[PDB]
Design a protein around this ligand. Sequence first.
Ligand SMILES: [Ca+2]
Length: 223
Amino acid sequence: IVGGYTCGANTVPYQVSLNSGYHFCGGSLINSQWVVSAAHCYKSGIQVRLGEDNINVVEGNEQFISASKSIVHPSYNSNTLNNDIMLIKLKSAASLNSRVASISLPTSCASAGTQCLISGWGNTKSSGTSYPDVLKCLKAPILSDSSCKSAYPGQITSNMFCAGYLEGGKDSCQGDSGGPVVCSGKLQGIVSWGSGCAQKNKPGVYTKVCNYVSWIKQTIASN
Ligand SMILES: [Ca+2]
């Protein structure tokens, strides 16, 4: 997250870190046994880390649970990033409390102008590299589809939205991928892609979760 603020420990209780020996992507806990992340974060050997603030220090609220099954969306396209969503099933259920909690799925899509919270452990610089140990947060609005398509001609599908600031300076970045965009207490986006970080006229692009609720629910019910 570029241009954000330190969230505070366990203030984003649905945020998870995906770990394969190191943090590589975020995700969101949607019930006690399932996480949603970006398909471009797929790999084998994932441990899900719940209850984290500092990802390099054991602080006492963590739960570390291995994945048993990962399911990339059936229509994910790695070239265009269309349908950039996956589900991860945990080997055992997490223990839910005030510091480790699920986030609700949306019943309707959010409109442009809605303010959302984006969070992650990604790079904090737009030029150069500095990775934080503690969770960072950013409040940002959803942008109109027309603005989004103007910024990225030919690249925005109906399964994507832009959020952020056309003036630059505040954005998600490398290492934030897969993490949550929460608006009015519902999961509306997944950190997906952009051109650089925090550049003028190049806001972040997010997977539009409201288009996937049916697939999520039916997949969980059967797996
Ligand atoms: Ca920790």
